[PDB]
Amino acid sequence: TTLTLSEAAPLLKKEFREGRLIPFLGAGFSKPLKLPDGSQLIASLAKTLGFEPELFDMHGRFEQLAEFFAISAPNRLQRLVYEMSLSFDSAEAEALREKSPMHRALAALDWRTIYTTNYDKHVEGALRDAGKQAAVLASFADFQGPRARDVCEVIKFHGTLDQPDTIVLTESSYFQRMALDAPPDQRLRADLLANSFLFIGYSFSDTNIRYIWYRMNQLREQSQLGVKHSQARRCFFATHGAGLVQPDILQQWNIDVIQLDPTDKSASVARLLESIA
Amino acid sequence: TTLTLSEAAPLLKKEFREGRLIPFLGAGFSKPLKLPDGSQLIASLAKTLGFEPELFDMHGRFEQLAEFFAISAPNRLQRLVYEMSLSFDSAEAEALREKSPMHRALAALDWRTIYTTNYDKHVEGALRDAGKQAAVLASFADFQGPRARDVCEVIKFHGTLDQPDTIVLTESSYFQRMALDAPPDQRLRADLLANSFLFIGYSFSDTNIRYIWYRMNQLREQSQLGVKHSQARRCFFATHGAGLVQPDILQQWNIDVIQLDPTDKSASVARLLESIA
Amino acid sequence: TTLTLSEAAPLLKKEFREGRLIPFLGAGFSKPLKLPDGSQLIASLAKTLGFEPELFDMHGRFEQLAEFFAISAPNRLQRLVYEMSLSFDSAEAEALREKSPMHRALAALDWRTIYTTNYDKHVEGALRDAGKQAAVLASFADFQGPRARDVCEVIKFHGTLDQPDTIVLTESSYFQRMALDAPPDQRLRADLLANSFLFIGYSFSDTNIRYIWYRMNQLREQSQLGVKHSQARRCFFATHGAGLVQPDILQQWNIDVIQLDPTDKSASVARLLESIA
Amino acid sequence: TTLTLSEAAPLLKKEFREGRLIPFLGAGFSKPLKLPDGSQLIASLAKTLGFEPELFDMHGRFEQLAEFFAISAPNRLQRLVYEMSLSFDSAEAEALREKSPMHRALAALDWRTIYTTNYDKHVEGALRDAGKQAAVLASFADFQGPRARDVCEVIKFHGTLDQPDTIVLTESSYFQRMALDAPPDQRLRADLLANSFLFIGYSFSDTNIRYIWYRMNQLREQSQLGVKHSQARRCFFATHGAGLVQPDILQQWNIDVIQLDPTDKSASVARLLESIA
Amino acid sequence: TTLTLSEAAPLLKKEFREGRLIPFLGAGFSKPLKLPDGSQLIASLAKTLGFEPELFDMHGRFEQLAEFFAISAPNRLQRLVYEMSLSFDSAEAEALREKSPMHRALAALDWRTIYTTNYDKHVEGALRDAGKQAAVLASFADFQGPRARDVCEVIKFHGTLDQPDTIVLTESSYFQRMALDAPPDQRLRADLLANSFLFIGYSFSDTNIRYIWYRMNQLREQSQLGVKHSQARRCFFATHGAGLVQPDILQQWNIDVIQLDPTDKSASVARLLESIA
Amino acid sequence: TTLTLSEAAPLLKKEFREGRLIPFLGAGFSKPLKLPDGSQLIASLAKTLGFEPELFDMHGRFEQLAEFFAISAPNRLQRLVYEMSLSFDSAEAEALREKSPMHRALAALDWRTIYTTNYDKHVEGALRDAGKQAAVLASFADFQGPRARDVCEVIKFHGTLDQPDTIVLTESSYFQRMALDAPPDQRLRADLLANSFLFIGYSFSDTNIRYIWYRMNQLREQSQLGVKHSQARRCFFATHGAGLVQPDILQQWNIDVIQLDPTDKSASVARLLESIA
Amino acid sequence: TTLTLSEAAPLLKKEFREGRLIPFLGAGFSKPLKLPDGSQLIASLAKTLGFEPELFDMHGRFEQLAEFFAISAPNRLQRLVYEMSLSFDSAEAEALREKSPMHRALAALDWRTIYTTNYDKHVEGALRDAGKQAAVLASFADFQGPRARDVCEVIKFHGTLDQPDTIVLTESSYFQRMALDAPPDQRLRADLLANSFLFIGYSFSDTNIRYIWYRMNQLREQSQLGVKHSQARRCFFATHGAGLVQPDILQQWNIDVIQLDPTDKSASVARLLESIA
To answer: InterPro entries from the entry (chains A, B, C, D, E, F, G) (predicted)?
Structure first.
């Protein structure tokens, strides 16, 4: 129950010719940019509170340690968003983004909507490197602004570093995004009615994208509760290690798993995006 | 920011004299009963599908492996609920429940409402051993039935083994209980307006009780959105290892952490419940 | 499809002996107290804005005219709540409440929970006249306070005049109570799981109690979505003019209509409450 | 250093003929209306918290006991404002206000501005009984509303019972009115530049009107800091017991003390207001 | 976001019929009177100190050069106020004031309060030419004096030339008027609670009236900090060149910009004041 | 809601190890020195004005009777400051200060800043008896003078007897210190941003330290009006009789009440200061 | 009335040996770091709103154009703070800060307190390059945190780029900092009582530092209003072009002007800071 590269290529091409394919890009898409972890950044900020960096990492997950900065030392949480903006959007990360085959193969296609969950600017900046125009959508003021219909709309699903109050990084902020009331969430509610999604750069043990995968399936079934049940467009999830139990769970959430070649991570994602063209 | 046994004893006693203390019992409360794990039970059922037991456990969490039985081999999921009912409610588990000081100290108090998240019958059966009456509340038909006001109402928050369609064990069933629409959820929505909760038998890395801890705090703040902000009754969480970061997070969710003595797990919980008397 | 007085009397008595009957009292229950209309009060306050009283009533419903005071002249809306508290809870209204057979027959029964939607104090004051104790529940601070189990809890579903920020009288406040997030709403979510309701003092053209009648039925059906469908306790609505189409609609909302004698309105309600005893 | 009735009568008449006399009415002006104390009302509300009424009065001043309701039981503070509105503005208090010679002698004069610090409506209602028009000014919305120049403006310096969020009764609300930032305070800042004040109904041990007496003098001296020092209009304070040290202190705060006849309190105030005519 | 002449005429007329419109007149209102600059006057007085007139103007703003006379040669600062009184209030300036259509259209309306920031007498003298009475209010002794209610009160916000110690012309005097403690400032604190302002004769680059525009908005928001936020009366600013960014800033300071016809400056202001009639 | 000696000892020790604990010493700290009352001293000076000492005390509070000397007989007010300097700083008061355990336990700790409100020299002289250096700060010339960083700065909040023009003893001087413009007040404005305060030697009925307790809380909340609300360091107030209502009021002013043993007043304060060490 | 380099060197050295000299660093101190203007940055962000960059600069000052982004397009104001943090704190600005003789001569001295008004980190980073420790103080949470007495405290008077809600850059934020209520303002109120200030890097036409220069002088004179007038420590302002009128104004604001050599701006500031050593 797992597609290969050559099997999924005519399936993705059919969704793209009629304009109904939306990429949903994760943290693994920014892997060739050699960015800092963030868990390494939050551990070095804990030295001022008396923590050793390996000892502060012991006390919980990354969003739980950021919860601790949000309530006990709020000036260090703003310091964390500050030095991620210097690191994730540095000039060295732009130079790797010029030569990355993943970001070139993404920008070679005329997308209409691109979703991403990472905070850096390298999804839009890939489109600017190809001479294309992109519109960042993170806050209410971004949606209200005018733009042309030719422009690909890049929705920052968890905020952008240039709008620091849109960042979803604290554990309490992840829990209140489960109600789906943010402006990126309301845009997702209308796009799942018409489109198929291509999830790239996630792991099966994320537990946040798994709730989104569940909740998208529940909103598709709820949208056809009184009418006869019609078949929906199939979503996709590109993986390098699919496993043996998790692809069967994802079938019932309207998502087919695509096994990519695990020898070179960045090349096999680039061959997937070039087979859509 | 952590209470001890002697510091939390007058705080719990003040809530109990005016009838506003509700225990919320977890899987660690059934630890002295020597029950099977359930993850061990689901691994031995996977031998018929060609899995080694250590290899089937590798492919995900326990609720995710039960999701796999719910969609690929539904007769093995009903087999799992069957042999948990033979194991968790066996005669050997009742005999340990007679002599358990945790279950005796729980039943020595005249509670009005007891919440529990585990499937076995040993919360009510502790009350039956003390000569007291208990009313199990898991489904809609349980709430509709008549009972006296003297009877302690034990709400099975995740179902009961004698009503197998109420069991919350599949991963999709955990995700749809986050909307809080079940009859145990609607009872919780009214009890958080008036009561304080005593959480016993959980870990900080549960990620399901953490959403409940968040969502109870959000429903308290939402219930006083137009009126002036008044101080609510404080909830409590008894732990044997509190850590160093997690008790500060729980303070903002209206929950004080009680450090119990970690040398004997079962005795220190029993000294907590006897200090309320 | 309409019950009479003698037909509904053993049905109401069976629900009352096992403690599962809750009155839900409307504005028609305070009809013998000779209170001012409120629409007459809001029209006389509009003289300072240049309106004739018959002309200000023309421009919309009562909750819509109170919306106009909430946004254009907020000191007149607080004046309206002020002079309803002088009028609805006057000493002349208490003296009629002493001799009212509706309020005496209500207080002759040992209720556990009484719901009411009107702002005046005459539901609790009927219980105080019979020597019984009542607990007013309108805000979050009311639920948090201590009380005995013998005391009948009177939940003010639309607020109380002694807590003016709990009053649901503006049109926008009626619309945001449709989400059912207030503390009287969260108490209603748990009481519909176990109880039957006796609606007294409403009209079929209210359009606010009709949404509540719909939404209670939807929450009963949602509470048994996975289990087998069991039969719920039947609710009741006492009327003096039932009509011919509206009682059939109410049957599908789990509500039986009771036709009372329309010659004397107050006496026939009093004969209903005395047949429960 | 104390004026009598006949000595102060040509001094008050000269300020009134040129329209520069403003009454500043205290709690002693509502003494013939036989109102409840308020300290008696707050003591009877403390029975629900377990206090005896003589024991709750022991723990502090009246504004300090109202501070205790504002933070520990906020629904009882709104209950206090509720039952003062039923008591201070009752029909029995209006009937005594019809026949009170103090309120008749106040309304027989064509005032331009009347200040009062008590919450009841009996300063305006005295003017309505004489067939005159009055404009209540307590909140920002009251000043914004239109009115004629003939109408006497009655500024409620500590709020009105029909606008309960304007009430200055909590101790913290008295402390933040010392900064003089409320809309009645900003009106007082401009009226002290041109007018003389007649303080009626205070005691020397009030400690709130003493700060106002100090701060008015400081604002007069600050308003002529660069120009040559000119003589200001003299303010007045009518008393029944002047004492021996306190009238000399008030001379340096630009206030002359008028000794009234202490045998009948209400008659001697009425002879003062009739000598102005 | 800019009103025209015909759009703002019913808005100004509605504020004037209910007596809540106050003009706030600047230096551009005395432009047709052909007065000397003052910066030209202070430069010619610097010849005695060894300055060329174009060189003395180089060393700072006009209020900063007057600061230099206040501390290094105080007899030349009094000389400056002397020869402004001979020049700004000359007989030639009165003869132009007789025939000025701006000053005739101002005096054709029955104002209650007129604010002005310029030192000359031509705001009152316009009212004396129309046969109307005016009361100059600049110092504490002016407010203390008696007057009738029919008389329009003209408050000199920065002093008058006949009271030379009230002149606000030194830079240090402008800085200490930012605390708003002068008698014209205390009158402004009470008038912003009830009135709308018509600012005529200023520029956007003044930086002194911009602080007043900010501080009036802050005092309106501070006056409704505990009550519900009600809508205030809108202020107005008549301009001949509005620009493109500055009218949007003024919207948040409760001020609408009125674009007047820039071809004839004096005629378009006169058409504005005649449309109010 | 009241700490004991052993409960508050680790809380005070944590603030002291990081140098953020400032004592704020009242008149009860100079109680073992057997000083004259001052109210007894001002009554004996009134014999020359014709007053009996028990009769002069009747006419007002102590600061009000000192107001009477400031305006009617100014040479007796300077006589009062003269004979307090002979009495409060006598050689007999120094000998009791040598053996006082309160003053020894205060000087055994290396404080950085000590505030006191009493006029005598016995707070610095306690530090000189322990061989430590102290710097008295009362006037502007004291702050301007040079000193080392090792020296504990003792700020005389109400003046010192060796600088008689700094004494805050007249009622008008207490009222003008409520604006917080004195040099001890400006130092307090910066120290509340970083430090926690230990109030020793006051009563709940002081009404001057209650305004300071209010105003410190208001300045903490004003200092974080635009940023997210962070938790401040908790202040402390040591008492021998705490009462039952007043400790709850002080909780909202960021002050925890410490109940000391009332059997020996001086010993229980000394055990508090030695538990910090 | 202007000091030279050699004349001011023993005056600055005497204030530094006794620890009473505080630098107050402006935007001209970050001039050798080759930072972008900010007015250039805000003009390039206006291209998305339809402005040419030379045309958007025409419509007002820099803080007024940032006011326009704060109310009409708030996502571009956060974009401005974002790309100043990438530009002002870049790695190229750190490398120039290593070799800057101004920043080396500043860090060669053991300061106790350094004030700065610019947003970049190069005042602390100069101290970190010399192996010294610095503590950034911008928000309330910064003052509450612990630190040693050896550490130089660098107070960011207008905020820091790593705490974006502390930035004072909008025109309305400059106007509300004139009340001096921010935590850097409250620290300035206590430091002017004891210290002398060295202002480096400002112009005479700033109009914001001129209000601070005025208001510091007013707070020194207010702090000695009742005592005899003593001479204060003299403040200093280093300039490259002093002019001819402005140094005489600054003498009355307790500030002496130091004329530095205008041929090399950065070298003459470095010779000033090395003459203090």
So the answer is: DHS-like_NAD/FAD-binding_dom
- Residue of E17, E199, E201 lying closest to E112 (CA atoms): E17
For residue F219, give the chain G residue with the closest CA: G181
The alpha carbon of residue F219 and the mean position of all alpha carbons in its chain are separated, in whole angstroms, by 20
CA–CA dist F265, F53 (Å, integer)? 29
Interface of E with D in 83-122 (CB under 8 A): none
DSSP G196: E
Q: Is E65 within 8 Å of G207 when comparing Cβ atoms?
A: no
Question: Is B222–C181 a contact, with Cβ atoms under 8 angstroms apart?
Answer: yes
Nearest to A5 by CA among A255, A195, A250, A267: A267
Contact between residue F195 and residue F123 where contact means Cβ atoms under 8 Å apart? no
**From CA F259, how far away is CA C68, in angstroms rounded?**
54
Contact G73, A143 (CB under 8 A): no
CA of residue A113 relative to chain centroid, distance: 13
Determine phi and psi for E131, rounding to 5 degrees: 75, 15
Q: Would you state the structure tokens that stand for residue C188, as one six-digit string?
A: 């209603």
Query: Distance between CA E95 and CA D29 in Å, rounded?
Result: 57
Contacts 24+ apart (CB under 8 A), E72-77: E72/G248, E73/E49, E76/E45, E76/E48, E76/E49, E77/E170
Radius of gyration, CA atoms only, chain B: 19
| Dist. CA B79–CA E105, nearest whole Å | 96
Residue C216 near residue C192 (C-beta atoms within 8 A) = yes
Q: What is the distance between the alpha carbons of residues F148 and E173, in angstroms, rounded to a whole number?
A: 39
Question: H or E segment at F62?
Answer: helix F62-72
Residue of chain F whose Cα is closest to the Cα of D174? F211
C74 to chain E, any CB pair closer than 8 A? The answer is: yes
Closest chain E residue by Cα to residue D183? E223
How many whole angstroms separate alpha carbon G23 and alpha carbon G131?
A: 19
Give the C-alpha separation, B200 to B214, whole Å.
17
Q: Please state, in angstroms and rounded to a whole number, the distance separating the CA atoms of residues G74 and A145.
A: 11
d(CA C38, CA A192): 48
Sheet of E21-25, strand order: E134-137, E152-156, E113-116, E21-25, E196-200, E235-239, E255-259
**E54 C-beta neighbours (distance < 10 Å), count:** 8
Q: Are the beta carbons of A139 and A163 closer than 8 angstroms?
A: yes
Q: How many alpha carbons lie under 13 Å from residue F160 in its C-beta half-sphere? A: 19
Experimentally, the structure was elucidated by cryo-EM
Q: Are D92 and D197 in contact (CB under 8 A)?
A: no
How far apart CA B81 and CA B86 sit, in angstroms, is 9
Q: In what order do the strands lie in the sheet with C113-116?
A: C134-137, C152-156, C113-116, C21-25, C196-200, C235-239, C255-259
G142: left (phi over 0), alpha (psi -120 to 50) or beta: alpha
Compute CA distances A63 → A77, F141, G55, whole Å.
11, 53, 45
Q: How far is G249 from chain E (nearest CA, A)?
A: 6
Query: What's the CA gap between A16 and A109, in Å, rounded?
Result: 9
Using DSSP, state whether C111 is helix, strand or coil: coil
* Structure tokens, D195: 């007018």
Q: CA C55, CA C214: separation in Å to the nearest integer?
A: 34
Instruction: State the DSSP H helix or E strand holding residue B134, giving kind and residue range, or none if neither.
Output: strand B134-137
CA geometry: angle at D91 spanning D87 and D97, to 5°? 95
Structure tokens at A179: 């109600």
The minimal CB distance from F166 to the residues G182, G187, G227 is found for G227
Interface test with D, best of B193, B228, B233 (most D CBs within 10 A): B228
DSSP state of E66: H
Q: How far apart are CA A234 and CA A251, in angstroms?
A: 9
Contact E65, E42 (CB under 8 A): yes
Phi, psi of F263 (to 5 degrees): -75, -45
| F86 phi, psi to nearest 5 deg | -75, -25
